[PDB]
Design a binder for this molecule. Structure first.
Ligand SMILES: [Ca+2]
Ligand SMILES: [Ca+2]
Length: 287
DNA sequence: GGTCTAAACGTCGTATAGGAGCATTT
DNA sequence: CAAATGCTCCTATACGACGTTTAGAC
């Protein structure tokens, strides 16, 4: 059985909290509904069934992508019990909090009033992309509810495993560089990318893993390039607390290249070619 | 001077997140 | 009816993932 913290982390990466407000058969003229969803590439449904098995709720689909969705009041109650017990720690937590207030309004059927509808619109206004042009036009001078800035340490190894399984990256960097014998440097790279709103979170993870540097481009990158930070810290970490989903295979290929660099012979033409073939067949070049 | 590692810097194209809205059941 | 939710399709930009140069150790 899959761990709950793996679930929260993975959701921290890939989930969405939504409120749909559609013109409508009804007295306020508007329909209000909450949605919670997690979406992945089609190849990873087994994770969803397992997660589904843990919570005992969610409806799964597989088409152009794979999604598990929670749309009924009871299932979202299951979702809320989960994230209340095993809380989110990225900025998406703030989205969660808006969703949760709205959900409760909806549970009490307060959404069927102009007053209640409007309060819900105040929650939706600060939720994700906020109010659409259509909704701004139909309901102007709306003041958006305040959104909590979440400011947080790593709760569990399985959380990191879920988050890296969504947003993490293992890639091989090849740089044209004449000062090297092969004409190329080979680097094993671990990376996490996140909007700057959570730099604190990134930093506790750096602290949590005892390695990596921050690169700022707004976006932030956690980047690990050091070979025996990679060897003696990152890989053992994801070795006891497993990366899940299709991304593991990339991780394994990443390990193989790390092994090749570790035996110091990636610095030969035959070896550099070898690593190149593997890199071109990992991550996006996989087809 | 040469070889190399670490990492600071640079940047593009699909893949997510987010969304919207009609159909069926409760 | 009307309220909830099942079901499916739409989209556009912030991560992924790829590439180059620099600081400097050995
Ligand atoms: Ca992802
Ligand atoms: Ca993301």
């Amino acid at each position: 059985n899959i761990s709950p913290w793996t679930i929260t982390g993975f959701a921290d990466g890939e989930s969405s909290f939504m409120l749909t407000v559609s013109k409508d058969k009804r007295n306020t003229g508007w329909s209000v509904r909450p949605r919670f969803r997690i979406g992945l590439h089609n190849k990873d449904v087994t994770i969803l069934k397992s997660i589904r098995e843990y919570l005992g709720a969610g409806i799964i689909t597989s088409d152009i992508d794979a999604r598990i969705r929670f749309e009924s009041l009871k299932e979202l109650e299951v979702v809320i019990n989960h994230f209340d017990k095993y809380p989110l720690i990225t900025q998406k937590r703030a989205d969660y909090l808006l969703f949760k207030k709205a959900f409760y309004l909806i549970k009490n059927k307060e959404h069927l009033t102009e007053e209640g509808l409007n309060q819900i619109l105040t929650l939706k206004a600060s939720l994700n992309l906020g109010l659409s042009e259509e909704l701004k036009e139909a309901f102007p001078n709306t003041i958006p509810a305040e959104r909590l800035l979440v400011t947080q340490e790593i709760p569990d190894s399985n959380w990191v495993a879920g988050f890296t399984a969504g947003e993490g990256s293992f890639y091989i960097r090849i740089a044209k560089n004449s000062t090297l014998k092969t004409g190329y440097q080979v680097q094993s790279v671990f990376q996490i990318t996140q909007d700057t709103r959570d730099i604190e979170l990134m930093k506790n993870l750096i602290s949590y893993l005892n390695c990596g540097n921050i690169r700022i481009r707004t976006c932030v990158d956690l980047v690990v390039t050091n070979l025996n930070d990679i060897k003696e810290k990152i890989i053992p970490f994801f070795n006891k607390n497993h990366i899940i989903g299709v991304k593991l295979q990339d991780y394994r290929d990443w390990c193989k290249v790390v092994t090749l660099i570790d035996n110091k012979e990636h610095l030969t033409s035959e070896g550099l070619e070898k690593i190149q073939k593997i890199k071109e067949g990992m991550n996006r070049g996989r087809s």
